[PDB]
Amino acid sequence: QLSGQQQRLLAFFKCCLLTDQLPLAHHLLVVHHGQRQKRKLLTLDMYNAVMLGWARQGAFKELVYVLFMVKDAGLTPDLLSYAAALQCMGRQDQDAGTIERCLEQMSQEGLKLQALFTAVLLSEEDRATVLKAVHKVKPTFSLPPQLPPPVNTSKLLRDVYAKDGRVSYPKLHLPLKTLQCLFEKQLHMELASRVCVVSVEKPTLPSKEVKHARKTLKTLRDQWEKALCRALRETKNRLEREVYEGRFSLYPFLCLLDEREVVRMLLQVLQALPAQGESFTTLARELSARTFSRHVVQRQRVSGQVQALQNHYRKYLCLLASDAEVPEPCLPRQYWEELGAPEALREQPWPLPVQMELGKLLAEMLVQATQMPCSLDKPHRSSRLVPVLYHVYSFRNVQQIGILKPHPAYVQLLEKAAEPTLTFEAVDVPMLCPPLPWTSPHSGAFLLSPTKLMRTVEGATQHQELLETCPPTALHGALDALTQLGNCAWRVNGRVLDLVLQLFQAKGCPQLGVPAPPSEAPQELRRELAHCQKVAREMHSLRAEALYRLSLAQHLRDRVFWLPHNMDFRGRTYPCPPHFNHLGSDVARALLEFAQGRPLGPHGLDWLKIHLVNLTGLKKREPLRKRLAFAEEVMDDILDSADQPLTGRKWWMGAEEPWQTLACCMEVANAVRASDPAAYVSHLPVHQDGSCNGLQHYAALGRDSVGAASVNLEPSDVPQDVYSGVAAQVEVFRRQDAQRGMRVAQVLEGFITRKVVKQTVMTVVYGVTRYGGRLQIEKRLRELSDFPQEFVWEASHYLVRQVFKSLQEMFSGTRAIQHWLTESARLISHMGSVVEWVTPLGVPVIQPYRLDSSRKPNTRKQKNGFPPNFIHSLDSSHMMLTALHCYRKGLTFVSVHDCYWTHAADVSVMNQVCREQFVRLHSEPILQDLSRFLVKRFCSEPQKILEASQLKETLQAVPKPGAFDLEQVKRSTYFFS
DNA sequence: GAGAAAACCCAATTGT
RNA sequence: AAAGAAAAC
DNA sequence: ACAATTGGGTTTTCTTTTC
Ligand SMILES: Nc1ccn([C@@H]2O[C@H](COP(=O)(O)OP(=O)(O)OP(=O)(O)O)C[C@H]2O)c(=O)n1
Ligand SMILES: [Mg+2]
């Protein structure tokens, strides 16, 4: 639509609004006014922007000049121009607030003044000044009254927002003053946008060469800072000269931030450069995004929104604090709106060309400015002024990419200096205060930085557009769930941290997940050397990850921290700080604990031992009674694991989840030797997971009796387990073929297990191909070290066979629903429309596939993605219902996606809630509601007759439900266990 | 400054 | 951006 | 029809990309 430069100049004029100094923007408008082609292709919004800026300045003469230019060249005044005129009259006093001209002209012309006060976004001060200038003539006008906040009246979300009920809303263990000073610490952390963490690499006793390298590095850093300041001044002068030469420039974009801050940015980006450095484009995009992240925070400091946030947050913490009370207990967003909330007013992101040009300019500045003497080993008087970073191209790849390499001496200086400090950005670290409530798609999560509501790659905006144009009460439960997942307080387990750091700083233990040092790689000649370099690179790449996660664990060791949460486009909720969270590896889950603990109660130690047995991986198919018996039998190994983790018989290393098993052995040993095990405060999360969840949801949509009996929707004394049935069938087939001398069938004995066929049997209901199942079985066979690696490939072809022998008596109505969904998605995409639906909790979901280069939907991708995305949206709705009705009863609830975590005391309660919020979820006609929504959405147009008829008879051919009572899932024991 | 690891699949979509 | 690996559902 | 494309879905992270 709009041109690149036409979109670019609007960002320019908004940027001149952002940092004042506005006559350069006015001068550029005058230069465009000089030549009639130069003011051509200029949109009206840039005139509105500069008028509003002069209104903020209070200059009426320039306002009238821009008005005259608006009536020139055929442009028409709109509402923002009258808002700017009334704002100028608000700042001034002449004409006594347009007695004679402006409001009378507006009323005569026919534009509505209620739309002036309400529709278009203005800040509170500008709204007040325009309100005063309107009150100059006809003072009897009043603003339309603020309505009481709307409450969602959806049937699934009626109980959570009904006042007539008993609620037990939990409170943090932290007093209000401590919470307030932690808010201050997080604010100071976000203001200086990066955090320094001491590295958990082995500290070395310093030597003379270490001092010499560090002194040289400090002198070089000071010289680089001076050089970057000179380069930034020269760039700012030349770009200001370009603005005064009447062309586009990025000079206000450099004037967004202080020169100190930009030089500190460039130096800290240089510090975290790889040894074989990052490409030009990624580094440029990082520089621009980091510049925007600092600009938002700086704008909130200057604009005064930080003090408003401070006041509101100190009034807000009374709901969460232990020693404070609210007059009526409410949900966190309801209390956030009850205390009159400020406008968020976070800046919308710039157009992508401006961002790219800013990044390349900053990167080329860093390449050009910083330099070093050539030789450090020989200190001659004549040393060549050599660059620190080099631009090289890459020959191997198809499309050549620029790579910035460090100068090779700098690598040895960084190795010998051995700086003990890593640097993180503030958004990649857990928050030190409770996060802001999710009150809108725009507000929530971090304090000063904007966070998306839906995680999207490549800047797809149709998800956010669906979330904005929905009815506002539809997202409430979703928002509530996200806030509920943010308010959980976490802490780091100390003993596990000491053990992992002992293994990490010493010789690493790759069996237990701890990466080994850069040494201890293994060491026809070229083949061996290439293998050693490849394995050494893999070892180094793993140990860097471990260094970052363990450094954050060391930093957050004596702290209480929070993880704000987010969604993807389906409804599924992930935490925002990436390095150290509970959706991670075994070590990440072992390090983490609830900061608030609850007493165990009668069923705390019982569920704790059940959780431990589930962690060891042994006894999966047994009832819970035999899980308890197994826990009671192996108690000596539990106590020896807890007492001597590394100098004992080391039974916990044999567990399927070994570090989590060690943490639970520590918790159990603390519980059993206590004087009163029942009144013991436990901080360890206990897990409950559902068996074959996508199959559970297919069975609940179909009401299939055999399907519901298959995935534990019908109660039984023993668990039912689909994958160990399919494994038994394939083992029967294998023995039959291996009796006939089939070599691939012969070399598989003891190698067909649940884990081999698990993902394939899980995935046949999502339309897997035989090729995808082959890669699944291949990756599961490569992990078994005992199995012959020469015969993996043929084994894979023998195992896509005999597993796809599930043709009859396996998931009939499940594949009927799957077929109807796939045909529905195929025929929706055949007309050219992406598949949209609404979650039963009200969340709109759209599929961002559109593989065109993005103009036309990719039919294959849409039909393959619709069954998993629909079932995943349903399980997210299940999770959010369970979370909300657990909040109403006082439960600390976090979710790892079919896996629900709580204290050991509340597990039964959560189970009850879980089953109820399944039953209420699928009692709704989800198939019928989806069918009529898709008929309304895609089959309501008169232009296409036959296509809409075929899609309508496809959509109205919904599969009929079977005969299964959903209430009986409330009686099920192994539904979630 | 300058060439035997080996990838092996095999049927539904899509630009042409 | 492409490749070598790793983790979670 | 012909040859190229593709392979059930989602989320996160690391050091290297000519030897
Ligand atoms: N590669 C994939 C694709 C989808 N899911 C989705 O997560 C759901 C449950 O996650 P799992 O950990 O695999 O648990 P189950 O399928 O229920 O198997 P189990 O009985 O052992 O818990 C199933 C499926 O809808 C998954 O875990 N892994
Ligand atoms: Mg599960």
A898 is catalytic: yes
**Secondary structure in 3-state letters for A351-405:** CHHHHHHHHHHHHHHHHHHCEEECCCCCCCCCCCEEECEEEEECCCCCCCCEEEE
Domains contained in chain A, CATH given: 4-135 (no CATH), 179-192+204-372+384-419 (no CATH), 598-682 (1.10.287.280), 709-800 (no CATH), 813-971 (no CATH)
Closest CA to A881 of A845, A846, A839: A839
Q: Give the 3-state secondary structure of residue A302.
A: helix
For ligand 1, whether the C-beta of A759 sits within 6 Å is yes
User: Does the beta carbon of A668 sit less than 6 angstroms from any atom of ligand 1?
Assistant: no
Ligand 1, closest atom to CA A754?
21
Ligand nearest to the CA of A776: 1
Residue A531 approaches strand D within 7 Å at CB: no
Distance CA A50, CA A335 (A): 38
Q: Are strands A385-387 and A371-373 parallel, antiparallel or unpaired?
A: antiparallel
Q: How far apart are the first and last CA of chain A?
A: 54
Say if CB A786 and CB A714 are below 8 A apart: no
Residues composing chain A: 977
Sorted by sequence, the CB contacts under 8 Å of residue A11 that are 6+ apart come out as A350, A351, A354
A105 phi and psi, to 5 degrees? -65, -35
Resolution (A): 2.7
Residue A616 to residue A627: CA distance in whole angstroms: 11
User: What does residue A275 show for φ and ψ, rounded to 5 degrees?
Assistant: -60, -40
Q: From the candidates A689, A889, A965, A970, which is the catalytic residue?
A: A689
Nucleotide nearest to A578 (CA to C1'): D12
> What are the two backbone dihedrals, phi and then psi, of residue A403, each rounded to the nearest 5 degrees?
-125, 135
A374-380: Cβ within 8 A, 24+ apart:
A374/A409, A375/A409, A376/A216, A376/A409, A376/A413
Beta pairing partners, A688: A900
Output DSSP code: residue A728: H
- Residue type (1 letter), A572: R
Strand partners, A210: none
Copy the structure tokens of residue A123: 């800040």
Q: A885-890, long-range: CB within 8 Å, 24+ apart, which pairs?
A: A885/A159, A885/A160, A885/A913, A885/A916, A885/A917, A886/A910, A886/A913, A887/A169, A887/A170, A887/A480, A887/A484, A888/A159, A888/A160, A888/A165, A888/A167, A888/A168, A888/A169, A889/A168, A889/A913, A890/A168, A890/A169, A890/A170
A:872-901 Cβ neighbours of strand C under 7 Å: 896-899
The residue annotated as part of the active site, out of A480, A721, A875, A898, is: A898
Closest residue, CA to C1' of D15: A541
> In Å, what is the CA distance from A52 to each residue of A39, A84, A123, A368, A541?
19, 5, 11, 39, 52
The DSSP secondary-structure symbol of A514 reads: P
CA of A765 to C1' of B11 (A): 19
CA distance A865 to A843: 18
Nucleotide nearest to A875 (CA to C1'): C9
Query: What is residue A686's three-state secondary structure?
Result: strand
Contact A565, A434 (CB under 8 A): no
**Chain-centroid distance, C-alpha A145:** 37
A480: annotated active-site residue: no
Considering only CA atoms, give the Rg of chain A. Answer: 32
Residue A798: its H or E element: helix A792-800
Q: Is A472 left (phi over 0), alpha (psi -120 to 50) or beta?
A: alpha
C-alpha closest to that of A915 among A888, A885, A892, A890: A885
Interval between CA A895 and ligand 1 midpoint (Å): 14
Ligand nearest to the CA of A689: 2
Residue pair A632/A609 in contact (Cβ under 8 Å)? The answer is yes
Cβ within 8 Å of residue A934, ≥6 positions away? A824, A828, A837, A955
Cβ distance A325 to A362 under 8 Å?
Answer: no
Q: Residues whose CB is under 5 A from ligand 2 (ion)?
A: A 689-690, 898
Closest CA to A51 of A71, A70, A34, A35: A70
Atom of ligand 1 nearest to the CA of A696: 17
According to DSSP, the residues that pair with A424 across neighbouring strands are A195
CA angle A36, A42, A48 (to 5 degrees): 120
Burial class (CB in 10 A: 0-12, 13-18, 19+), A589: buried
Q: How many Å apart are A584 CA and C7 C1'?
A: 6
Chain position carrying tokens 């970057």: A228
Q: Which of A684, A686, A687 is nearest to A663 (CA)?
A: A684
Ligand 1 close to Cβ of residue A694 (< 6 A):
yes
Strand order of the β-sheet with A899-902 is A686-689, A899-902, A894-895
* Closest atom of ligand 1 relative to the A695 alpha carbon: 25
Amino acid A194 CA to nucleotide D14 C1' distance, rounded Å: 20
Whether residue A20 lies in the annotated active site: no
Residue type, A25: A
Neighbouring-strand partners of residue A324: none
Determine the Cα–Cα distance for residues A548 and A527; give it in Å rounded to an integer.
32
Structural method: cryo-EM
Q: Of residues 365 to 404 in chain A, which lie within 7 A of strand C by their beta carbon? A: 394, 397-399, 401
Within 10 angstroms of residue A963's Cβ, the number of other Cβ atoms is 7
Measured distance CA(A931)–CA(A923) in Å, rounded = 16
Strand ranges, E, within A415-474? 421-425
Q: Which atom number of ligand 1 is nearest to the Cα of residue A868?
A: 25
Is A104 within 8 Å of A117 (Cβ atoms)? no
The rounded distance, in Å, linking the Cα atoms of A649 and A749 is 30
Whether residue A772 contacts residue A758, with contact meaning beta carbons closer than 8 Å, is answered with no
3-state SS, residue A796: helix
Chain A 578-597 residues in 7 Å CB range of strand D: 578-579
Q: Is the CB of A898 under 6 A from ligand 1?
A: yes
Alpha-carbon gap, residue A730 to A400, rounded angstroms = 48
